[PDB]
Amino acid sequence: LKLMIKINEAVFYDRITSNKIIGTGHLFNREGKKILISSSLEKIKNTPGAYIIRGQNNSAHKLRIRIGGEDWQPDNSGIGMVSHSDFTNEFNIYFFGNGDIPVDTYLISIYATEIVGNKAVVQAAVTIAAKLN
C-alpha cells in the first residue's frame, strides 16, 4: 500500500473561503482494505481529520487544514477519516480556516493504513506567498 498527494498551484484573489480544496491525495494498492486516513501534525480539537501546520520561517504562522472527501467519514474517536469501500481512490485536502494566511512554507504530512498494521506516509511543502499585480 502506497500514497500520493498533489497540491494544486493556484491564486486566491479574495478571501480564503474555508472548505476550499487546495490539494488532492490519490491512493493505490488497497484493494480490499478499510483505510484510515490521518496526520501526526497538531490536531485541531474541534474536528476529526483536521490539523494545524506551522510556518517553517515562523512557527507562530499557522495554516489550518482538513482532509476528507465524498467517500470519507470520521470515526467517533477523532483520529481520522475512514473509507469502507474499494473504489474510493481519492480524497481532498481543504483549507479549514477563517481568513487568509501568512506567507511561509507549511510542511504538510498525511498517513493512511488498513484497520492497525504498518503505515504509509507522504509529505509536501505547501508554499504561500504574496503576488502583487
CA–CA gap between residue 38 and residue 54 (Å, rounded): 17
- Chain centroid to CA 37: 9
CA distances from 62 to 58, 91, 95, 103 (A): 9, 22, 11, 10
Resolution of the structure, angstroms: 3.1
Place of cell 500514497: 3
Q: Which domain holds residue 41?
A: 1-133
Are 29 and 35 contacting, i.e. CB atoms less than 8 angstroms apart?
A: no
Domain count, the chain: 1
DSSP letter at 55? B
Are 66 and 47 contacting, i.e. CB atoms less than 8 angstroms apart?
A: yes
- Look up the CATH number of the domain holding residue 95: 2.60.40.1570
Cα torsion at 63, 11, 28, 114 (round to 10°)? Answer: 20
CA–CA gap between residue 23 and residue 115 (Å, rounded): 25
17 grid coordinates:
473561503
Run of H or E residues at 17: none
